[PDB]
From a paper:
Here we describe the combination of rational and computational design to deliver three-helix bundle (3HB) peptide assemblies and single-chain proteins with control over topology and thermal stability. First, we garner sequence-to-structure relationships from antiparallel 3HBs in the Protein Data Bank. This gives core-packing rules, including layers of hydrogen-bonded polar residues, which are combined with surface-charge patterning to design complementary sequences for acidic (A), basic (B), and neutral (N) helices. Next, AlphaFold2 models for both designs are used to seed computational designs of single-chain proteins where the helices are connected by loop building. Synthetic genes for these express in E. coli to yield soluble, monomeric, and thermally stable proteins.
Author numbering: -2 to 95
């Protein structure tokens, strides 16, 4: 679970960095293409992913401070981060196609 926790922290950190980077790419698309509803949908999704990542970070913090972390909480965190990785990959593609 130590290895598990350490790995989830690195995954979370990489998702935060990728998601922040996509905010600058989206803003550049907004300057280039104007205020389309398509870009509005991508901004909303980027914001939601950042919100979810912030919430998960609080749960990771609690588990790190726990002297015997619940394996179920760890597994649930692992699943949620896996979902956000896919969602962030799909957004990376969509911004690259615009």
């Amino acid at each position: 679970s130590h290895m598990m926790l350490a790995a989830l922290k690195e995954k979370l950190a990489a998702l935060k960095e990728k998601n922040a980077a996509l905010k600058y790419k989206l803003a550049a698309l907004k300057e280039k293409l104007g205020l389309t509803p398509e870009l509005a949908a991508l901004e909303k999704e980027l914001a939601a992913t950042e919100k979810e990542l912030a919430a998960l970070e609080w749960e990771l913090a609690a588990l790190e401070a726990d002297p015997n972390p619940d394996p179920a909480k760890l597994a649930a965190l692992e699943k949620k981060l896996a979902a956000l990785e896919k969602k962030t990959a799909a957004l990376e593609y969509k911004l690259a196609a615009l």
